Amino acid sequence: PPYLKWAESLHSLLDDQDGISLFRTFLKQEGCADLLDFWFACTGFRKLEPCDSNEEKRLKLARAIYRKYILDNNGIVSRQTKPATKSFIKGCIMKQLIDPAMFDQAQTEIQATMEENTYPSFLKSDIYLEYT
């Protein structure tokens, strides 16, 4: 049963659209869906190839992710990412040197944040319990 696999690893949960939907609903109610959106945004950004034809799209995307989740140090993603990590990202943005893996560290920190609090809480939530 898919729902059982989701309790074995966060990666299993996020590899299932029903799992993602349920988990995002839970996060939304807890006021932190940005954690998951950001996680997927980094993955989506990274899979874009660094060729000339994608240059403009990639820069606009990198800026968008930065502006919404990294810029203001008050959002939940920004609050859960390290100063040095955000500094490096800002530098990539300003220099316009945006390697596909530039958000990797931030993504790892946010992934840990979910594994540490919201993921476990989700598995013990009414939403999950009801679904199962």
Partner: peptide, 16 residues
Amino acid sequence: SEDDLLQECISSAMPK
């Protein structure tokens, strides 16, 4: 820079 651009990016990373 754009929620719509972020949404397209997020969608591309979804399973299936």
